[PDB]
């Protein structure tokens, strides 16, 4: 029995978890996913990996998941393990709504799932979830927020972050253009396209390869929408003309 055991919840000589770090390698192969914060709203931008001629396209989104009335998340890593985690996030958000009769704060929902992901790394002898999650939402305590999640159960509140393929190069590119406390949603969408175009395997950029979703508070209500192809096409062309205007 112990001969066939892989030993997942065990420390290494250097003081680190192997199965967690190997799960971190799994996310680095997945599609590029970035989310950035603005003054009037907050948005997510993800690289769609499911690209084929004979795909049906039924769902509203591929990697953007709706969790709450005021909250949404994005996925980087294994799609199957993500479907379990996103379903759990929807349950925790509803348990809080049943108990307190008010929407769950953004930080409380992120920490709740990260407690479960930490449990898998400490006890159980099972493989950890190889999924990194980017959360966007609004609460009455702090407002518009952005969060990053790790397989170890590690969370962090960001203003501009990226996870997935070419994550190290993209986060440095986001560090170059971002302006603190002055960025609007209009300039944020232009910044997101700028990063995705440069940090990608197949360049030029088409509407089918990318997926952008926005979260904005309108008339005292949170509005979460996935931008359609025609809306995305305009954002690419606005950056495409900026490429031509650069040579002058």
């Amino acid at each position: 029995s112990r001969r066939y055991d892989s030993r997942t919840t065990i420390f290494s000589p250097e003081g680190r978890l192997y199965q967690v770090e190997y799960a971190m390698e799994a996310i680095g192969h997945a599609g590029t996913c970035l989310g950035i914060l603005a003054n009037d709203g907050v948005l997510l931008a993800a690289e769609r990996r499911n690209i084929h001629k004979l795909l049906d396209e039924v769902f509203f989104s591929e990697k953007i998941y709706k969790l709450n009335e005021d909250m949404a998340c994005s996925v980087a890593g294994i799609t199957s393990d993500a479907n379990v985690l996103t379903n759990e996030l929807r349950l925790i958000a509803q348990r809080y709504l049943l108990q307190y009769q008010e929407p769950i704060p953004c930080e409380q929902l992120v920490t709740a799932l990260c407690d479960i992901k930490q449990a898998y790394t400490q006890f159980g002898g099972k493989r950890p979830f190889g999924v990194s999650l980017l959360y966007i939402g609004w609460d009455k305590h702090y407002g518009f927020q952005l969060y990053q999640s790790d397989p170890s159960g590690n969370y962090g509140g960001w203003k501009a972050t990226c996870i997935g393929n070419n994550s190290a190069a993209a986060v440095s590119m986001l560090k170059q253009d971002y302006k603190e406390g002055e960025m609007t949603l209009k300039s944020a969408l232009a910044l997101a396209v700028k990063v995705l175009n440069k940090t990608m395997d197949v360049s030029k950029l088409s509407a089918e390869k990318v997926e952008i979703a926005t979260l904005t508070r309108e008339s005292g209500k949170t509005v979460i929408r996935v931008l359609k192809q025609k809306e995305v096409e305009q954002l690419i062309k606005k950056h495409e003309e900026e490429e031509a205007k650069a040579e002058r």
Binding site: F11, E14, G15, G157
Partner: protein, 239 residues
Amino acid sequence: SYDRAITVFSPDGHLFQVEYAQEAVKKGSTAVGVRGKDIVVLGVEKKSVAKLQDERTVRKICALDDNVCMAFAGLTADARIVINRARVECQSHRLTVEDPVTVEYITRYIASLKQRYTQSNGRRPFGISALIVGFDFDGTPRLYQTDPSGTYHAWKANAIGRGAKSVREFLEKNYTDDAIETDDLTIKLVIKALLEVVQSGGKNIELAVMRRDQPLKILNPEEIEKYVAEIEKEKEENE
């Protein structure tokens, strides 16, 4: 249920899983806390925040109760579990004993929690060390620290994390009655100790102060740089 033995004894007489958890806390960010006359102050070094990240979420200083607060080092995912488990115990103590929880009791609970995970089936040791800070009902200042094995000790001044040995040797030569004379000089002792390991501090330092009657006070970078300007001013005067 998973019932495999994780932490086991070795030929030489060492528990490797406990020792590796002590390697995880060394790789984490530096945390130092000193005990003064009226106030106890802890602070964390090597924040290494990309500046593009909200520094409200990555705060290592966490208050367990109204009179108890702690700073940690190592795996931040493991500490968040322990903090929450300790926070329940602070309220669970109040339901059984109408008196508020003392610094010595809450430290014994955290240490026993770390000790049980080094002996239970299927469970790994916690790779964190905690600097438990607070005041007793008498008004006497206290400072405690724990480790992965589950051993707790009271300190006058101690540091944990990366370069913990460097700050300890600095504190062995600096901690005197004159150093902890006033409330401002106790805080200045922390920053002087933090600058020994951290690469050019000021914005990479976050520290909290608490008084024997007043709640926890988190100081903003505008207040820290006031002391940084004062310490370097007296450092310039010597040469």
